[PDB]
Automatic annotation (TrEMBL), chains A, B:
This is Adenylyl-sulfate kinase. It catalyses: adenosine 5'-phosphosulfate + ATP = 3'-phosphoadenylyl sulfate + ADP + H(+). The gene is cysC. Belongs to the APS kinase family. It holds the Pfam family APS_kinase. GO terms for cellular component: cytoplasm. Adenosine 5'-phosphosulfate binds at residues 43, 52, 57, 60-61, 83-84, 118, 130-131, 133. It comes from Archaeoglobus fulgidus.
Length: 173, 173
């Protein structure tokens, strides 16, 4: 009766929301109950005035982890899309969630910018993307995630297939 | 399938946790998926250093309500045990939750004080804690809750039967 959480982490513009939406539609089409936690949409609903300091982002991540823990332990496949840039935060998520599937959409900064110049500009202008020494400074890459997909080399359909294959191998479906 | 939320509100020692646990056991024995959401427990887990300004308490109310909204929209009965002292913030919860069951354990101060294993009333009277709802914090009683139980006059099994009777009348099972 315990379900699982697909935790999609990666820098802004890597393709997290695109993959999250496609996974949601795929698993719903196979008949499963699924819930999508869009990190930015959760922020807008719960605390739209919260800033983007390290301590504020950590509190937001802890809220998302707890929502995903409660949903998944009641049998709901939960898909999370959050930057979650520090390994320590994702290791906290992993210890809180019994069946944790860490998915890393890996994509060079040059491609991330080319795919959405206006969106990245707007987020950086608002202080949502930090870059005291540059854009690529902050994110800490997962060392052994369940899935890595290179979104500059794969289609979204291939990314979905890679995640599903791993879910099958884990026995989660 | 949309499920419902049992929102148990009232001052410390009124019997919220006891009723929450008994309803959980009863509804689980009937075959339902149920989740217990203790509002102060969530605050202590997620952000134990969060203050108690009006803005921070409003944030926390929104977090608890959204957890319940997400669980109940995926078919999970959510039983919320939460002091929730303000009528207006329970109206927010009522608007967010499609099938909302507000339950008020009404209990005179004398009896709450005799049902206080954590010693909260004693701590509040000696100034070790402040703003205890039902002592030096005011509690705003519900105007028209779905259920009022006088927990100094009813047994827990009688309270469960009263809640269940109203759930039957509401058609929420
Ligand atoms: N596999 C892919 N191939 C081509 N473009 C992609 C791919 N994945 C995402 N994109 C595009 O990249 C941009 C950023 O994706 P998005 O999912 O919004 O990123 P994030 O949620 O990580 O910020 C969007 O324009 C999206 O359509
Ligand atoms: N109807 C009742 N009759 C007798 N004792 C009760 C009743 N309801 C609750 N209690 C007792 O009151 C005490 C405090 O109850 P609790 O549910 O912890 O209060 P709250 O969660 O509102 O702070 C518990 O020890 C519990 O067993
Ligand atoms: Na409602």
């Amino acid at each position: 009766s315990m379900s699982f959480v697909i935790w999609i982490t990666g820098p802004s513009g890597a393709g997290k929301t695109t993959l999250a939406n496609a996974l949601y539609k795929k698993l719903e089409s196979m008949g499963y109950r699924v819930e999508l936690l869009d990190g930015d949409g959760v922020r807008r609903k719960l605390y739209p005035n919260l800033g983007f300091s390290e301590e504020e982002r950590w509190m937001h991540n802890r809220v998302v982890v707890e929502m995903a823990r409660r949903l998944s332990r009641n049998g709901i496949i939960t898909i999370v899309s959050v930057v979650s840039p520090y390994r320590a935060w994702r290791e906290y998520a992993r210890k809180e969630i019994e069946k944790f599937v860490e998915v890393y959409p890996r994509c060079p900064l040059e491609v991330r910018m080319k795919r959405d110049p206006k969106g990245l500009y707007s987020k950086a202008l608002r202080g949502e993307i930090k870059g005291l020494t540059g854009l690529d400074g902050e994110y800490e890459e997962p060392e052994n995630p369940e899935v890595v997909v290179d979104t500059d080399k794969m289609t979204v359909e291939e990314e979905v297939e890679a995640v599903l294959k791993k879910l099958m191998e884990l026995g989660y479906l």
